[PDB]
Symmetry: D2
Subunit: 98 residues, 4 copies
Amino acid sequence: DAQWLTAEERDQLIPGLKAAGWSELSERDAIYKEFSFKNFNQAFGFMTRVALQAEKMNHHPEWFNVYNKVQITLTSHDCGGLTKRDVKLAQFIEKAAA
Amino acid sequence: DAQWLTAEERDQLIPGLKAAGWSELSERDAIYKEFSFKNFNQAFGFMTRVALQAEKMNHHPEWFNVYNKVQITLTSHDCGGLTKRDVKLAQFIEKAAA
Amino acid sequence: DAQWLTAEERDQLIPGLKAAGWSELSERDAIYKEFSFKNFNQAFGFMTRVALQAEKMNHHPEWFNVYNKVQITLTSHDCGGLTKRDVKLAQFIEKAAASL
Amino acid sequence: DAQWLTAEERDQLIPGLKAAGWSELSERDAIYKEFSFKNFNQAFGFMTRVALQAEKMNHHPEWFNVYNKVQITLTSHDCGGLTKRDVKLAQFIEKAAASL
C-alpha cells in the first residue's frame, strides 16, 4: 500500500509494533526502533536479511549501525508519511530480529 | 589450530558435530552438512553471518546454495585435512543456523 | 517471463551471454559461468549484490563458492528450463561482476 | 595500533585521506565521509565488503545508510580517538568504493 495510513489502519497496525518496541517520532510521521544484538556478526546478518527484504519490497530503511546496535527509522519518502509498506517492513524486521 | 586433528581431538570434537547432523566424507578428510531454511532470505542471512566469521578466522567454507538450501563442506586446504579451525567454524555455523 | 525461451528468443538473447563467457550446460536447459575475484571479500560482496537482485526479481541462482571463486548456474526450476528471468539475472550478474 | 595517532602519524597518514574526501570531525577525534552509489544494491554490496573487513580486523565503523547513500565515521571507542586501525579501515573503504 502506497497511500498514507488512515486513522483506522493506524489503530489496527501500530499498537502491535509499539508493543514490540517501536515508537512514533515527534517531528516526522515515521516509526523508530533501536535493536541491540550480541555483536556485529549478528547485527550485520540481521541487516542483510532486512536489505534483501528492502529490495524485494522496493522500500528502504533509514538506519544507523555501530557494532551491535542498529537504529531503524521507517517512513515513506514518496508521500512523506507512514504507509502499509512501512508496517510490512517493520513486521519483517521483527521476524528477522527474533 | 593449523595442524591436522589428532585421534584424541577427533574423538573429543567430532561426535558433537555428528549429533548435530555433520558427516565425514569418504573421499576426503572433510566434514559436510546440508542446512535447510525456510527461504533464501533466511539462507543468505545465515551465509552472511558465516562469511563474516570466515573473514574473522581467515578460514573459508566450500558451499553450494540454491534458494533455501545451503550445503557446506569444511576442510583445511593448506594441510589437506581437518583442523581445529574446521571444528570452530562448524561450531559457529551451528550457532548461526539456530 | 515464466515460459521456456522460444527458438527465436534463444537466437536473440543467448549469443550475447556466450560472448560474455556463459555456456549452455550439456545435461540441463541452463546456463553456467564461473567468476573469479581477487579474494573472498570481493567474491562475497558480489554474491550479496546478486542476492539482493534475486530477492528483487524473486528468481534465484544455483551457486557454489570457495574463497574467490563463484560458479553460477541459472535455470528456472518451476518449469525445468531457461526463461527470460534467467537471462535477466545473467545480465545483472555481468553488471555486478564488472562493478557497474 | 590501539593508541591514538601521534602528531607525526597524523601528518603522515591524514593528508592522503583528506585528499580522498575524508574530513576530521569538529567534535570528535574521528574521520567522516559520505559515499554515494547508483542505488541500494550497490551501496549494500559495498557495506558488505566493509563489514567483512571489519570482522577481519576486529574494528567497526559507525555508519548511516539511506538507499544509495552511506555515511561513515571512523574512530576507536576503546580509547576515544583516532588510531592506526581507523586509518587502515579508511584505506580499505576507499579500495572497496572504487571496486578494487
